[PDB]
């Protein structure tokens, strides 16, 4: 049941919680976030429900059963990636939690080798988010933050899997959030913090609708050099083919 | 005194029956008891729609002197006291009850479906001695004579609904 | 293993610089778990230990005891190199292992397998309390040679006590009722219970322990001096209170999804039995079971049918439920001749020999999460139809006795084969009358299955053909191909599902689905149930209440595990509203005529 969480009113200026956000994930490495001024306009997260028009080819919503619309929203201004939803309320909380995301992780990404190629994000504005919305027996597999960093709203959203991570057990940990805003890093910022992360199994939750801000680092991203030559973007876009069925175009097929 | 209450049987057979029968029903248990009674919570009426919502609330979801000091009060007035009753509310209460033993021994020509028209005389002295203790709420060594009006009409309400 | 000293080393080698996926040693988090939590047991993850080192993990064959001794003060030590301050807070850390897959049930256990590791199953018969064991004679006092002042006859008397004590807790652990083959008594093991698990466990309750199996004596000799009794005794290490292949579930949702399984299920539910569709879809309804609901409002309410069962001599009811006993997963059954009140719910005892309290689980604790099945009731004493009523109304069995207090729990549903007083059915006569059971546990049961015998020209004429043929079909690796198959054949003269495909069924259900409702009907059933009342006072008396009414989504939740929706259908409540009203219709007088027509409404 224990998760650390922090009052955001002391740290609103930015200069309060950076060094000890390093020191509790290098032990717990999932953080909860709480009362941040997004209150309202977060609960109005029903406005983009029945589009259903659109096919996927990799962008926009992917309508996989009037069960699932996954908005796989395509980072707008890159190249060869040019998506935008409705999402009106979705959009104006992208905003707010993506300004607190940026707050997040120049308080976080900063305690590491190098504080600017991942929130490089800055510079061309790489998000391409996940929009999952589980609207009217198994469901998606075990899901690991696919990117590196992600804060989201969230009711129970969490589970385990037999394997070594934090709270080692290997016994699924699911617990509830009433109003509690879940963060969790990813798989590549462990690798770029040199191994101090973990990883959570998400399912269908009350909140079966994910709005997910994944940092995304942006597309020609050099990793390290064990990723010089397989930078995050394509490992983690045939991540984002691998889990779902993929048959709408012939190149997901292949892959 | 004493406190006796449980799930009665039946569910709610209390309703059709007398206030009683939680247990057996048995006339010989009866008698050297005194007064029986229903409670009333916020929950009458869910019998007929609300229970349908009620499943689904399963599915889908001091500011008085303190008890201390009331127990205080309590252990000084069995230190010492003398609240006794009024004489005026007493023959009020004789009146409120004999009178209407005499507006019923003429309303027996109208052969009323009361079964056998009972012998109030130990709810009688009950109610008494409930306006003594309403009167110790006072410190009266003779009976003020709100507290005993006030719990002579709450008690002639109980006692003619058990009539009922 | 003398030299085990780098033997110890080399498996503190996994101790704490073992991680996986990364990092996040599985031990690195156990031990300030426990300095944070206090629990002085360890956790052995099996599985990881397995891929660390095969010959630590084999070493649980030759003195797997020594080796677990010899590991976890190491262990100890480790969490105190770790937390300075751990090793005062306790007094003494012994580890638990994860996991086996070896899963020898009771019905085998052989002298190969004692002293070793054992993974067993089956369920706590009963339990005791507490005990100080005693465990120049250490825990002998059977072995006296000459330390006695009249050794030779004049007999010098040792005390029981001042002696070592073990938190001591010994519990009898059975095979599981219905999978007992019917004839074999099922074995009995005593399973020793300790420090960190002593009372960690109930009676009636499934558990799988994972202790060794030791062949050790018993100091209450009671046969000869030098001969304590001796019992293959297992000690627990691991306590788990607690699958089948992906296609078998794909092709199960194939067959599931039909539109014909509501009543395949029924025409299949029976093996061999001719009509009582009705009485049939009862059972399957009863059978699968409905989604219970704890309510902390006002008073747990179980999601779990009881089908009373108003017999008539040569109806085959007492088959019927001998199907359910086979087909089931909890079945108990118990006749009304050897009712005992003090078997059927639980009990608390001394014994005798041992002068030990133990408490012993009832047939509804014996078959908790599951059916309890019962017959011939009006052929019972009273007060076992006293105690079956508070269980039934508690659906659990408090207890409060000398020297215990607790409260086993008895969700389990009952089954009851009944028989009119005297004889048959004497006519329309109420169903209340036509039997001596009280009214409150007839109002306990919600679905009362009213069968009747009576002549007929023609339908006893086929019924007699069906019966007739059943009596003809009763009666290497090829050969055993060409019996299966033909076994097959025979399982689809019956042409419904086979068999074995519906208890995988009733498994799968009774696990997996949960199915709720929505708010659409529920209120319009209550307008139905408002319109049952009207047609119930209108009958004069009645028993019309709240359990009535909630039997009909008991029901239908039922009803959606058979159709496996996780939400209620409308045809499935229609169902439910049909078999409720009619069960009641039954019960009623000669009225029964025009209450077809009166609370006709519904249908
Ligand atoms: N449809 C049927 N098909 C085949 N046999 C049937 C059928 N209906 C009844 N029977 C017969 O019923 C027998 C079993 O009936 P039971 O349920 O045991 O009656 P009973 O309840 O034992 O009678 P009691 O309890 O003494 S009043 C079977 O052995 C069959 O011979």
Same mark, same amino acid.
């Given at each position: 049941?224990?998760?650390?969480?922090?009052?955001? /009113?002391?740290?609103?200026?930015?200069?309060?919680?950076?060094?000890?956000?390093?020191?509790?994930?290098?032990?717990?490495?999932?953080?909860?976030?709480? $009362?941040?001024? $997004?209150?309202?306009?977060?609960?109005?997260?029903?406005?983009?429900?029945?589009?259903?028009?659109?096919?996927?080819?990799?962008?926009?919503?992917?309508?996989?059963?009037?069960?699932?619309?996954?908005?796989?929203?395509?980072?707008?201004?890159?190249?060869?990636?040019?998506?935008?939803?409705?999402?009106?309320?979705?959009?104006?909380?992208?905003?707010?939690?993506?300004?607190?995301?940026?707050?997040?992780?120049?308080?976080?990404?900063?305690?590491?080798?190098?504080?600017?190629?991942?929130?490089?994000?800055?510079?061309?504005?790489?998000?391409?988010?996940?929009?999952?919305?589980?609207? /009217?027996?198994?469901?998606?597999?075990?899901?690991?933050?696919?990117?590196?960093?992600?804060?989201?709203?969230?009711?129970?959203?969490?589970?385990?899997?037999?394997?070594?991570?934090?709270?080692?057990?290997?016994?699924?940990?699911?617990?509830?959030?009433?109003?509690?805003?879940?963060?969790?890093?990813?798989?590549?910022?462990?690798?770029?913090?040199?191994?101090?992360?973990?990883?959570? =199994?998400?399912?269908?939750? =009350?909140?079966? /609708?994910?709005?997910?801000?994944?940092?995304? =680092?942006?597309?020609?991203?050099?990793?390290?050099?064990?990723?010089?030559?397989?930078?995050? /973007?394509?490992?983690?876009?045939?991540?984002?083919?691998?889990? =779902?069925?993929?048959?709408?175009?012939?190149?997901?097929?292949?892959? | 005194?004493?406190?006796?209450?449980?799930?009665?049987?039946?569910?709610?057979?209390?309703?059709?029956?007398?206030?009683?029968?939680?247990?057996?029903?048995?006339?010989?248990?009866?008698?050297?008891?005194?007064?029986?009674?229903?409670?009333?919570?916020?929950?009458?009426?869910?019998?007929?729609?609300?229970?349908?919502?009620?499943?689904?609330?399963?599915?889908?979801?001091?500011?008085?002197?303190?008890?201390?000091?009331?127990?205080?009060?309590?252990?000084?007035?069995?230190?010492?006291?003398?609240?006794?009753?009024?004489?005026?509310?007493?023959?009020?209460?004789?009146?409120?009850?004999?009178?209407?033993?005499?507006?019923?021994?003429?309303?027996?020509?109208?052969?009323?479906?009361?079964?056998?028209?009972?012998?109030?005389?130990?709810?009688?002295?009950?109610?008494?001695?409930?306006?003594?203790?309403?009167?110790?709420?006072?410190?009266?060594?003779?009976?003020?004579?709100?507290?005993?009006?006030?719990?002579?009409?709450?008690?002639?309400?109980?006692?003619?609904?058990?009539?009922? | 293993?003398?030299?085990?000293?780098?033997?110890?080393?080399?498996?503190?080698?996994?101790?704490?610089?073992?991680?996986?996926?990364?990092?996040?040693?599985?031990?690195?988090?156990?031990?300030?778990?426990? @300095?944070?939590?206090?629990?002085?047991?360890?956790?052995?993850?099996?599985?990881?230990?397995?891929?660390?080192?095969?010959? %630590?993990? &084999?070493?649980?064959?030759?003195?797997?005891?020594?080796?677990?001794?010899?590991?976890?003060?190491?262990?100890?030590?480790?969490?105190?190199?770790?937390?300075?301050?751990?090793?005062?807070?306790?007094?003494?850390?012994?580890?638990?292992?994860?996991?086996?897959?070896?899963?020898?049930?009771?019905?085998?256990?052989?002298?190969?397998?004692?002293?070793?590791?054992?993974?067993?199953?089956?369920?706590?018969?009963?339990?005791?309390?507490?005990?100080?064991? &005693?465990?120049?004679?250490?825990?002998?006092?059977?072995?006296?040679?000459?330390?006695?002042?009249?050794?030779?006859?004049?007999?010098?008397? +040792?005390?029981?006590?001042?002696?070592?004590?073990?938190?001591?807790?010994?519990?009898?652990?059975?095979?599981?009722?219905?999978?007992?083959?019917?004839?074999?008594?099922?074995?009995?093991?005593?399973?020793?219970?300790?420090?960190?698990?002593?009372?960690?466990?109930?009676?009636?309750?499934?558990?799988?322990?994972?202790?060794?199996?030791?062949?050790?004596?018993?100091?209450?000799?009671?046969? !000869?001096?030098?001969?304590?009794?001796?019992?293959?005794?297992?000690?627990?290490?691991?306590?788990?209170?607690?699958?089948?292949?992906?296609?078998?579930?794909?092709?199960?949702?194939?067959?599931?999804?039909?539109?014909?399984?509501?009543?395949?299920?029924?025409?299949?539910?029976?093996?061999?039995?001719?009509?009582?569709?009705?009485? !049939?879809?009862?059972?399957?309804?009863?059978?699968?079971?409905?989604?219970?609901?704890?309510?902390?409002?006002?008073?747990?309410?179980?999601?779990?049918?009881?089908?009373?069962?108003?017999?008539?001599?040569?109806?085959?009811?007492?088959?019927? %439920?001998?199907?359910?006993?086979?087909?089931?997963?909890?079945?108990?059954?118990?006749?009304?001749?050897?009712?005992?009140?003090?078997?059927?719910?639980?009990?608390?005892?001394?014994?005798?020999?041992?002068?030990?309290?133990?408490?012993?689980? @009832?047939?509804?604790?014996?078959?908790?999460?599951?059916?309890?099945?019962?017959?011939?009731?009006?052929?019972?004493?009273?007060?076992?139809?006293?105690?079956?009523?508070?269980?039934?109304?508690?659906?659990?069995?408090?207890?409060?006795?000398?020297?215990?207090?607790?409260?086993?729990?008895?969700?389990?549903?009952?089954?009851?084969?009944?028989?009119?007083?005297?004889?048959?059915?004497?006519?329309? &006569?109420?169903?209340?009358?036509?039997?001596?059971?009280?009214?409150?546990?007839?109002?306990?049961?919600?679905?009362?299955? +009213?069968?009747?015998?009576?002549?007929?020209?023609?339908?006893?004429?086929?019924?007699?053909?069906?019966?007739? *043929?059943?009596?003809?079909?009763?009666?290497?690796?090829?050969?055993?191909?060409?019996?299966?198959?033909?076994?097959?054949?025979?399982?689809?003269?019956?042409?419904?599902?086979?068999?074995?495909?519906?208890?995988?069924?009733?498994?799968?259900?009774?696990?997996?689905?949960?199915?709720?409702?929505?708010?659409?009907?529920?209120?319009?059933?209550?307008?139905?149930?408002?319109?049952?009342?009207?047609?119930?006072?209108?009958?004069?008396?009645?028993?019309?209440?709240?359990?009535?009414?909630?039997?009909?989504?008991?029901?239908?939740?039922?009803?959606? !595990?058979?159709?496996?929706?996780?939400?209620?259908?409308?045809?499935?409540?229609?169902?439910?509203?049909?078999?409720?009203? *009619?069960?009641?219709?039954?019960?009623?007088?000669?009225?029964?005529?025009?209450?077809?027509?009166?609370?006709?409404?519904?249908?």
């Amino acid at each position: 049941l224990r998760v650390p969480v922090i009052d955001l /009113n002391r740290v609103s200026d930015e200069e309060q919680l950076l060094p000890v956000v390093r020191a509790i994930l290098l032990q717990h490495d999932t953080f909860l976030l709480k $009362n941040y001024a $997004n209150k309202a306009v977060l609960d109005a997260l029903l406005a983009g429900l029945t589009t259903k028009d659109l096919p996927d080819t990799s962008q926009g919503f992917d309508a996989n059963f009037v069960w699932l619309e996954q908005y796989i929203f395509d980072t707008d201004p890159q190249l060869r990636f040019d998506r935008k939803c409705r999402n009106e309320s979705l959009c104006s909380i992208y905003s707010r939690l993506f300004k607190l995301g940026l707050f997040f992780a120049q308080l976080c990404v900063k305690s590491v080798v190098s504080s600017a190629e991942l929130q490089d994000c800055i510079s061309t504005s790489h998000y391409a988010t996940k929009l999952t919305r589980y609207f /009217n027996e198994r469901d998606y597999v075990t899901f690991l933050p696919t990117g590196v960093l992600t804060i989201f709203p969230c009711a129970k959203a969490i589970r385990y899997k037999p394997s070594t991570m934090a709270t080692t057990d290997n016994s699924w940990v699911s617990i509830d959030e009433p109003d509690c805003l879940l963060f969790h890093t990813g798989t590549l910022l462990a690798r770029w913090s040199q191994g101090m992360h973990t990883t959570s =199994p998400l399912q269908i939750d =009350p909140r079966a /609708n994910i709005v997910s801000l994944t940092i995304w =680092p942006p597309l020609t991203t050099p990793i390290s050099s064990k990723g010089e030559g397989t930078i995050a /973007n394509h490992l983690l876009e045939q991540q984002i083919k691998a889990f =779902p069925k993929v048959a709408q175009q012939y190149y997901p097929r292949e892959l | 005194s004493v406190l006796a209450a449980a799930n009665p049987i039946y569910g709610r057979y209390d309703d059709l029956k007398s206030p009683g029968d939680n247990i057996d029903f048995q006339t010989t248990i009866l008698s050297r008891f005194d007064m029986i009674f229903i409670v009333k919570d916020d929950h009458n009426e869910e019998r007929d729609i609300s229970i349908a919502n009620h499943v689904i609330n399963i599915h889908t979801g001091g500011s008085e002197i303190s008890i201390e000091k009331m127990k205080r009060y309590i252990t000084y007035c069995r230190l010492k006291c003398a609240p006794r009753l009024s004489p005026q509310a007493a023959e009020k209460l004789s009146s409120n009850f004999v009178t209407i033993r005499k507006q019923l021994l003429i309303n027996e020509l109208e052969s009323t479906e009361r079964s056998s028209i009972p012998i109030t005389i130990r709810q009688l002295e009950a109610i008494i001695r409930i306006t003594e203790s309403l009167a110790k709420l006072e410190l009266s060594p003779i009976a003020q004579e709100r507290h005993v009006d006030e719990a002579i009409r709450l008690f002639q309400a109980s006692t003619m609904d058990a009539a009922s | 293993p003398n030299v085990s000293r780098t033997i110890a080393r080399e498996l503190k080698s996994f101790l704490l610089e073992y991680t996986d996926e990364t990092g996040r040693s599985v031990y690195g988090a156990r031990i300030r778990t426990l @300095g944070e939590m206090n629990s002085e047991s360890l956790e052995v993850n099996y599985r990881h230990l397995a891929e660390s080192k095969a010959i %630590l993990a &084999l070493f649980l064959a030759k003195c797997p005891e020594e080796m677990l001794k010899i590991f976890d003060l190491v262990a100890m030590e480790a969490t105190e190199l770790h937390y300075p301050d751990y090793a005062r807070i306790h007094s003494e850390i012994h580890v638990r292992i994860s996991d086996f897959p070896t899963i020898y049930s009771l019905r085998e256990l052989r002298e190969s397998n004692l002293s070793s590791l054992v993974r067993v199953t089956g369920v706590v018969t009963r339990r005791t309390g507490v005990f100080p064991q &005693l465990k120049q004679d250490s825990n002998e006092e059977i072995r006296i040679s000459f330390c006695t002042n009249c050794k030779s006859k004049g007999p010098f008397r +040792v005390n029981g006590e001042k002696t070592v004590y073990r938190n001591y807790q010994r519990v009898t652990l059975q095979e599981a009722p219905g999978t007992v083959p019917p004839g074999r008594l099922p074995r009995h093991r005593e399973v020793i219970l300790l420090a960190d698990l002593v009372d960690v466990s109930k009676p009636g309750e499934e558990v799988e322990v994972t202790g060794i199996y030791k062949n050790n004596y018993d100091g209450n000799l009671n046969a !000869k001096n030098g001969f304590p009794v001796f019992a293959t005794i297992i000690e627990a290490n691991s306590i788990k209170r607690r699958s089948w292949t992906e296609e078998e579930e794909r092709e199960f949702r194939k067959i599931s999804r039909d539109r014909g399984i509501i009543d395949k299920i029924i025409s299949s539910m029976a093996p061999s039995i001719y009509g009582h569709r009705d009485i !049939k879809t009862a059972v399957a309804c009863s059978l699968f079971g409905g989604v219970p609901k704890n309510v902390n409002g006002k008073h747990s309410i179980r999601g779990d049918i009881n089908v009373l069962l108003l017999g008539d001599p040569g109806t085959a009811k007492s088959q019927i %439920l001998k199907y359910v006993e086979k087909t089931a997963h909890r079945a108990v059954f118990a006749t009304g001749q050897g009712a005992s009140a003090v078997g059927l719910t639980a009990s608390v005892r001394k014994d005798p020999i041992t002068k030990e309290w133990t408490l012993e689980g @009832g047939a509804l604790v014996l078959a908790d999460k599951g059916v309890c099945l019962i017959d011939e009731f009006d052929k019972m004493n009273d007060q076992d139809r006293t105690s079956i009523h508070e269980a039934m109304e508690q659906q659990s069995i408090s207890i409060s006795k000398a020297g215990i207090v607790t409260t086993l729990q008895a969700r389990c549903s009952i089954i009851a084969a009944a028989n009119p007083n005297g004889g048959r059915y004497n006519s329309t &006569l109420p169903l209340a009358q036509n039997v001596s059971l009280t009214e409150p546990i007839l109002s306990r049961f919600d679905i009362l299955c +009213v069968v009747r015998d009576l002549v007929d020209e023609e339908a006893d004429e086929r019924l007699a053909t069906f019966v007739v *043929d059943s009596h003809v079909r009763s009666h290497q690796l090829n050969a055993r191909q060409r019996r299966l198959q033909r076994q097959r054949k025979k399982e689809e003269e019956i042409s419904p599902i086979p068999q074995e495909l519906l208890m995988k069924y009733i498994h799968y259900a009774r696990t997996k689905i949960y199915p709720k409702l929505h708010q659409m009907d529920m209120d319009k059933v209550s307008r139905v149930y408002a319109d049952l009342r009207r047609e119930s006072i209108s009958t004069g008396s009645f028993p019309i209440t709240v359990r009535h009414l909630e039997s009909i989504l008991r029901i239908a939740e039922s009803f959606a !595990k058979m159709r496996l929706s996780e939400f209620v259908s409308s045809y499935d409540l229609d169902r439910a509203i049909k078999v409720v009203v *009619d069960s009641f219709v039954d019960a009623q007088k000669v009225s029964v005529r025009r209450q077809l027509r009166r609370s006709f409404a519904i249908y």
